[PDB]
Design a protein around this nucleic acid. Sequence first.
DNA 1: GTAGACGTGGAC
DNA 2: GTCCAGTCTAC
Length: 259
Amino acid sequence: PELPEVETIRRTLLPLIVGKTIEDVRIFWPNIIRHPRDSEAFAARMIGQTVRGLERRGKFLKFLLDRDALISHLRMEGRYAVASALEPLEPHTHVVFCFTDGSELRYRDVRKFGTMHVYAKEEADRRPPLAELGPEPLSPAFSPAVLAERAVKTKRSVKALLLDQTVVAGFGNIYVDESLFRAGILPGRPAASLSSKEIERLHEEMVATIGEAVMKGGSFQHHLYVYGRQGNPCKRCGTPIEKTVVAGRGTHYCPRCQR
DNA sequence: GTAGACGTGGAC
DNA sequence: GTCCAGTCTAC
Ligand SMILES: [Zn+2]
């Protein structure tokens, strides 16, 4: 998931867990636990703490407890669900947080790529993986100036620039491809070749795209212009949508609308 | 940067 | 059977 999908998870999950106290933490795939390294220590420190809140930073979820903050990245297929501790678990459940009321928060991840870091609240934003993240796209911190500063300083493609979480946090393959189309810019061109008018236009479309996506609860898939539409006619000009590889990933675009 | 890594499963 | 699908990393 990207910012919109993670933001949607944050909103619906919060009311289901706020105020609940942790009684036990069970881990079925240790690799997911990154800090502390020892999964036994990870489990023991959260016992007895109550969930006080849930925030998002980039594509990360930040569970706020009493003293600690649990930082979770879903990567490609991680997902959360709340259910009764009396029912059988679903396939690929790797971590489970059991509460004192008999309910539990389950974490599933088919590909096992997700990660979890636990730090004291005051240290979380200063340690990895949150430490070097760029500004939030829906905040005053992100502006054309910030984009320009990083753009006019590299030779890599504009898609690579946008996928770099240190530049701006939250964009992935789907929204980078969609933002570039709406702004009318080819994904493979040098980030340093973009004019001042283009950068402003891109900033405008990035904010609007991510904003509309959050409103629709993420993929909004019915409002996609290019992602996954290769071979189909452009919604704006009718030219067949094409797909290639840019910055080591599948990239979708319209050869006429984007220049 | 442009591929391959890290587990697992669906499309063709 | 076999190519494709968020960060890291090493030829
Ligand atoms: Zn078009």
